[PDB]
Amino acid sequence: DEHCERLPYDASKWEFPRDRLKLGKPLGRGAFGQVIEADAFGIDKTATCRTVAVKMLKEGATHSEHRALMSELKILIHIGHHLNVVNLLGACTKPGGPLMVIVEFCKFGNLSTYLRSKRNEFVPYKYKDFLTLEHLICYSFQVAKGMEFLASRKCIHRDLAARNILLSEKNVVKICDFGLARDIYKDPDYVRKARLPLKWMAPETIFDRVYTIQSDVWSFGVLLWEIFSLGASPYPGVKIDEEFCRRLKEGTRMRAPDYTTPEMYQTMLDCWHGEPSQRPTFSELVEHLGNLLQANA
Template identity: 30%
Template sequence: MEKSSDGFVRADQIDLKSLDEQLERHLNRAWTMEKNKKKEEDSTFINNNSNNSSSILSTNNNGLNLITTTTTATKIVKKERKEWEIDPSKLTIKSAIARGTFGTVHRGIYDGLDVAVKMLDWGEEGHRTESEIATLRADFTQEVAVWHKLEHPNVTKFIGATMGTSELQIQSDNGPIGMPSNVCCVVVEYLPGGALKGYLIKNRRRKLAFNVVVQLALDLARGLSYLHSQKIVHRDVKTENMLLDKTRTVKIADFGVARVEASNPNDMTGETGTLGYMAPEVLNGSPYNRKCDVYSFGICLWEIYCCDMPYPDLSFSEVTTAVVRQNLRPEIPRCCPSSLANVMKRCWDASPDKRPEMEEVVSMLEAIDTSKGGGMIPVDQPQGCLCFRKYRGP
């Protein structure tokens, strides 16, 4: 599979009215330019080919000569649609639900299905070089190539994608808004529960019941175990990239930097992912493999249990230095059952070889007893936990 740059697309929760207005003005302007350009091209094509015809002399059954005129302008070769490519005419794009560096995530309907539409807009023409656009398109193609073949209950279902079409429109309050031709989009199932990150933030004060913690962790572990069985390394495992359906099932999303695992670890290097979740070998620029996902899972497991962010008081540079050189890890609360704490510690071991495979992680989580209604504090220890900070978020 073709390699691409290590850039990735995020969909941060930024939805300001002013940005909406700017986006709408930009899209209207780009759409108008695209329509005018297409009209000019069509006019030029017709003028150049109106006289470009050929006469073919043939003989019918009666021996009479017949003249058949063919016009090259009518010879149109229809582009064959790829297996993952959607029919833009069946897609209705609605309001934005998230925004990121290179685009937005919208609600939508495709062929009667509720979908989320991840739209990547790489800027107006002239603002990026051809090589930059080519790299971004290669990244997009990589994501589609990875995602469209996956089928698992804990992986967000891929519906289809399209690259560089002017047929897309957004249904706004003021009517449809056309999209510029360099826009690409990925269409996936819509999951109403939103990101796991948001769910954890909502529960920062009261925390989650222990059986809920284990169930969320199991969903994520099973999804990652499946990816690894398909030789896929996600490379950006974090709670922001995990979505919840209406039954609170976790599904892995965002394969923007996912790759097929290289047989030679030296072929996979570079800082890819999100600080706070990145394994030491990734932060250090060393060769790595699927075990970098296992490390990230360990951080996510801590986050699910604590409903908090790792290293909230450290800068990015401080986190990088401390994780690599000082073996810094999030502090496990005293109230955390040893069975769960053991999973965290094994997953975020500094040595990738000592980390378990995700298949083993699934088995360890399945073996944890949650029948006692939570067990946030081991029964053999004094009750009443002061592990968590008094003030935790808004």
């Protein structure tokens, strides 16, 4: 996924005509990119109008950002379809218009915002639309599934967080990446030096700047904390600086979130192990959360 200029674009399969795509109101805006809500006619089903999310650039973007987006398109094609990864539906790449990457619409938006909104409507055990402990383990399991899939397609995420998990209908959650559609300069999550999501980054990524599937496992552990604090921000009160990293470098971890179970907090700790090889794989995380899901019901 770092050598994606060699990956094909099959236009006869993926090209969607711009005149069958009707753009609506923006869902997220960054500095160079945006995600737009749209209506797409017959994109996945014959003569069927479907709501979709369109990822594209905006005023300020250059040829450089255009290449990056074309890369994200090619990677999504390569990766292929999976329930818990935001599915590609088509693209407008023809000259005379902007590069548009057309993906699934996820009604309920990002998982961080959504979980926050459900603090009032939560009960561990079951209330028509109330979240439960089961819902939370289920989300965790789904994301682990999606990440196992991505890992097996020889690529890594690099920005795994609740804000990059979307919630569709019927409790399906999907891994995505807003990328340039997120305003990293005005988002508190991205601390200044490049703007990096330091609270989700593993020590070797902070100090040595090494990105691996195992550093995503670390980030998954932080996502678990977000899920089981119902969308709270990680390391509350604590300010992210040079002396915040040294504490992590010698084993200071977050306390248990308000809604966790003992096993779930232990799973966060496993993910936050110092040695990258000592962290569980996503294959192991899928089996383990599957067990915990069964133990809950």
